[PDB]
Structure 1
Amino acid sequence: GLAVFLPPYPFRGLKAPYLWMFYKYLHCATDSILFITGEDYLSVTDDEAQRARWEFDPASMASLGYELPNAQSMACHEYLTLDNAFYETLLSRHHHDPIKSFSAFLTERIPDLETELHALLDSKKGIIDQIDTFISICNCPSLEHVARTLGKEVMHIEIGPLRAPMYRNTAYLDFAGVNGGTEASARYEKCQAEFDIKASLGDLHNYFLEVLPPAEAAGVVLQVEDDSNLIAYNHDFTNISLLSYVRQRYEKEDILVRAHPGSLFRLRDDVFTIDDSANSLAFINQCNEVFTINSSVGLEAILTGKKTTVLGDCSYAFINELAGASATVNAAAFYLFSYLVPFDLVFNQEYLKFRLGHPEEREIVGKHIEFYSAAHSLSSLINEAISL
């Protein structure tokens, strides 16, 4: 059985922040799941005051592919609820800075949290013995240590870098960590010689493109300031120091900035030239090279053959650090077909069992292409796919 970890701690000012994953696993569940979560996740569906949350938007339910759970759907699983008081305690140990508290939660072992997790799991020890793996939407060394004591692994699972409408929907699945401390590079290193791809980057990019590619400066990508990427996995770089970094190398009218609509702040009116392109691709094509901390837009540039500079930690960084025309295509082919997972599968318990048995990269790739579609060797599967 699965144990899904969905912490209630409002680090970013939002209750039940990972509610969409709760709804998604509930909608896709076939067997009982152990949810390690908070009481807010259990009351929010019936909370008449949180009716305007984006998770309840019909467009979001359709985009992420779930429906709202009824009583039977929610009640037929197992629950362990994390104590509401631990958040305030964590805050007090970091000068009540919610951001710095979030960072510690993502990158450090927290004894109090491990203790509570142990106590919760011990209350249903018979249930825990049946657990096949732990699942987390974010890194959490506390949870990861606790899982090791039980001889269990933690699958880190998150929305992927390529998404609709532009691309096929993808997801992250990482045994080491998602976004930060990813295992993507280590995975490719072990199975590199199995990848001999007969294609260009355009061929790897168009297969995932679902829309007619746009027609044919220094690009700077801004991101949301208070997410895990810029709080913990940024190598101390920020939106400000990123702009400062590029400024050390370029003049103002040679710089095109791509703002993120979800950011708390935006650049003042007449400081930089702001891009107003219909999409990421239309922005990238106006640039000679692209600068980013760890935006997924950076992946898109690399896939289109644009010179990209990555200042933060991310899953696709190892691809860019390769000098070679064919060495890059092979690395990207692995990332796209073997590392990235079709979005729906990471919520499919049968697929998760498959990944849990530690299958060969060939089996993983074949399973993904099988999903994408409507040959035996790994390279032949990919080559045949991006030609048809």
Structure 2
Amino acid sequence: GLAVFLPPYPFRGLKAPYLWMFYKYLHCATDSILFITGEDYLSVTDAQRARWEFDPASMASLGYELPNAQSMACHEYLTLDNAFYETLLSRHHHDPIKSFSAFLTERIPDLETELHALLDSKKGIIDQIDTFISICNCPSLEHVARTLGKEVMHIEIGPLRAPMYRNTAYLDFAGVNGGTEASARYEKCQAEFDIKASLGDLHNYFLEVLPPAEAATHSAAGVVLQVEDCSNLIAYNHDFTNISLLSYVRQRYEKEDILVRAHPGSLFRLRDDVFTIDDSANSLAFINQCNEVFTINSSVGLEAILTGKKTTVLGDCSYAFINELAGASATVNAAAFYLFSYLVPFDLVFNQEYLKFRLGHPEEREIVGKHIEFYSASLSSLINEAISLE
């Protein structure tokens, strides 16, 4: 059985922050699941149905329906208490973002004590768990898992998303976004890797539309801004922020040569009278008119690499190791492995059968084969003609 960990702590000021993954697992569930979460994940259906998770375009794009009493009663629930969250805040001077960073990057002994108490609250629970699944890093939970002998798959929506791309997801046994294992997996297959496809072929395989035509007018430098309170910008950012990213670029380019694109999910937008503000319908059309791209650790960085743009990546993230290679050919090879073996087809990370497949730690070849099979209806060879056939 899966034990899916969906923390209810509203670090960013919003109840049931990870509600979409709750609804996705419930909808795809083929077995009884053990949810470790908050009661907020169960009520909210009662007066804020103006949230994006309830939007029909959200549901169609992510492929889930809303649950009912029957759908939810099929599973088991362990609910965390809010009193620990209140205590956590005061231990970080009442800063919820700081507390969020601690949650992501430090063991919290009181939380380990509660998780142990909950897992033990009913006998047989622990022995039925085949793996934990967590939507974010959590050293409290990971310490608990070591003690009980259980693995932890970290899982999230990936850097390529619909409608521009095939939906992808992350699945990492060590950590998602921060502390990933993508680099280590690649360096063991670097020996026998020679992708014959070009970078554009790789990009086109995952694009649902054709890449944009030439922009005609370009800007020397593009700046990707991100969501200010995403785990990427508060814990994995090497201390960089949007404004210091801007400053970093201003050490190199005049104002006239900087094109800035705010994140559509951010609470803030750029004012007009300072920089040239991108207005493209999507980040690829913005990338298309820049000579080089600057980011902390936004998904758009991978788009920039996949289109052959010089990219600066200031924070920690899953694809950074690709940007640290010196050549276009090493880049293609690393990129192919990242797209076809590290990234998972979105629906599969919610497929209990596929999760048990990965819990057996199969060879990379087997991993790439399963993904190519889903995308379609030697590891270099599989990819090589997978691109050609497509």
What band does the TM-score fall into relative to the shorter chain?
Answer: over 0.9
Q: Hey, what does 2:223 align to over in structure 1?
A: 220
1:264-300 alpha-carbon deviations (Å, 9 max, x no partner): 2222321111011122121112111100000010000
Instruction: Tell me the distance in 1 between the aligned counterparts of 2:328 and 2:268.
Output: 39
1:307-358 alpha-carbon deviations (Å, 9 max, x no partner): 0000000000000111123211110010000000000000000000000000
Instruction: Tell me the distance in 2 between the aligned counterparts of 1:271 and 1:148.
Output: 51
SS in 1 for 2:209: coil
Instruction: Tell me the distance in 2 between the aligned counterparts of 1:265 and 1:203.
Output: 35
Asked if 1:4 is matched to 2:4, the reply is: yes
C-alpha displacement of 1:195: 2.0
Greater Cα shift, 188-197 or 200-209: 188-197
Give the aligned CA root-mean-square deviation in angstroms.
1.0
Instruction: Tell me the distance in 2 between the aligned counterparts of 1:65 and 1:272.
Output: 38
SS in 1 for 2:206: coil
Instruction: Tell me the distance in 2 between the aligned counterparts of 1:33 and 1:22.
Output: 11
SS in 2 for 1:294: coil
Q: Hey, what does 1:43 align to over in structure 2?
A: 43
Greater Cα shift, 16-25 or 48-57: 48-57
Instruction: Tell me the distance in 2 between the aligned counterparts of 1:264 and 1:119.
Output: 38
Instruction: Tell me the distance in 2 between the aligned counterparts of 1:160 and 1:99.
Output: 23
Q: Hey, what does 1:19 align to over in structure 2?
A: 19
1:163-214 alpha-carbon deviations (Å, 9 max, x no partner): 1111111000000110011100011111222322111101111111110211
Instruction: Tell me the distance in 1 between the aligned counterparts of 2:224 and 2:254.
Output: 16
Instruction: Tell me the distance in 1 between the aligned counterparts of 2:98 and 2:272.
Output: 30
SS in 2 for 1:359: coil
Q: Is the 8 A contact 2:204 2:210 kept in 1?
A: no
C-alpha displacement of 1:135: 0.2
Question: Any stretches of 5+ residues in structure 2 without a counterpart?
Answer: 215-219
Greater Cα shift, 280-289 or 218-227: 280-289
Instruction: Tell me the distance in 2 between the aligned counterparts of 1:293 and 1:382.
Output: 30
Instruction: Tell me the distance in 1 between the aligned counterparts of 2:328 and 2:51.
Output: 46
C-alpha displacement of 1:223: 0.6
**What percentage of aligned pairs have identical amino acids?**
99
Instruction: Tell me the distance in 2 between the aligned counterparts of 1:182 and 1:119.
Output: 29
SS in 2 for 1:180: coil
Greater Cα shift, 88-97 or 193-202: 193-202
Instruction: Tell me the distance in 2 between the aligned counterparts of 1:132 and 1:126.
Output: 12
1:1-388 counterparts in 2 under 5 A?
1-45=1-45, 48-216=46-214, 217-374=220-377, 378-388=379-389
1:62-98 alpha-carbon deviations (Å, 9 max, x no partner): 1110001111110111110001111111000001000
Instruction: Tell me the distance in 1 between the aligned counterparts of 2:35 and 2:225.
Output: 34
C-alpha displacement of 1:133: 0.2
1:89-116 alpha-carbon deviations (Å, 9 max, x no partner): 1000001000101000000000111111
SS in 1 for 2:36: strand
C-alpha displacement of 1:122: 1.0
TM-score, structure 1 normalization: 0.97
Instruction: Tell me the distance in 2 between the aligned counterparts of 1:137 and 1:353.
Output: 17
Greater Cα shift, 112-121 or 261-270: 261-270
Q: Is the 8 A contact 2:293 2:304 kept in 1?
A: yes
Greater Cα shift, 254-263 or 344-353: 254-263
C-alpha displacement of 1:61: 1.0
C-alpha displacement of 1:27: 0.4
Greater Cα shift, 57-66 or 361-370: 57-66
C-alpha displacement of 1:235: 0.3
SS in 1 for 2:388: coil
Q: Is the 8 A contact 2:261 2:277 kept in 1?
A: yes
Greater Cα shift, 345-354 or 54-63: 54-63
Instruction: Tell me the distance in 1 between the aligned counterparts of 2:122 and 2:307.
Output: 51
Q: Is the 8 A contact 2:153 2:171 kept in 1?
A: yes
Q: Is the 8 A contact 2:169 2:346 kept in 1?
A: yes
Q: Is the 8 A contact 2:12 2:96 kept in 1?
A: yes
SS in 2 for 1:386: helix
Instruction: Tell me the distance in 2 between the aligned counterparts of 1:198 and 1:61.
Output: 37
C-alpha displacement of 1:49: 0.8
Q: Is the 8 A contact 2:32 2:75 kept in 1?
A: yes
Instruction: Tell me the distance in 2 between the aligned counterparts of 1:192 and 1:71.
Output: 50
C-alpha displacement of 1:360: 0.3
Instruction: Tell me the distance in 2 between the aligned counterparts of 1:373 and 1:50.
Output: 39
C-alpha displacement of 1:32: 0.7
Greater Cα shift, 254-263 or 13-22: 254-263
Instruction: Tell me the distance in 2 between the aligned counterparts of 1:220 and 1:139.
Output: 27
C-alpha displacement of 1:125: 3.5
C-alpha displacement of 1:263: 1.5
Question: Any stretches of 5+ residues in structure 1 without a counterpart?
Answer: none
C-alpha displacement of 1:22: 0.5
Instruction: Tell me the distance in 1 between the aligned counterparts of 2:190 and 2:55.
Output: 43
Instruction: Tell me the distance in 2 between the aligned counterparts of 1:264 and 1:51.
Output: 19
C-alpha displacement of 1:25: 0.4
C-alpha displacement of 1:56: 1.3
C-alpha displacement of 1:243: 0.2
SS in 1 for 2:16: coil
SS in 2 for 1:244: helix
C-alpha displacement of 1:126: 0.8
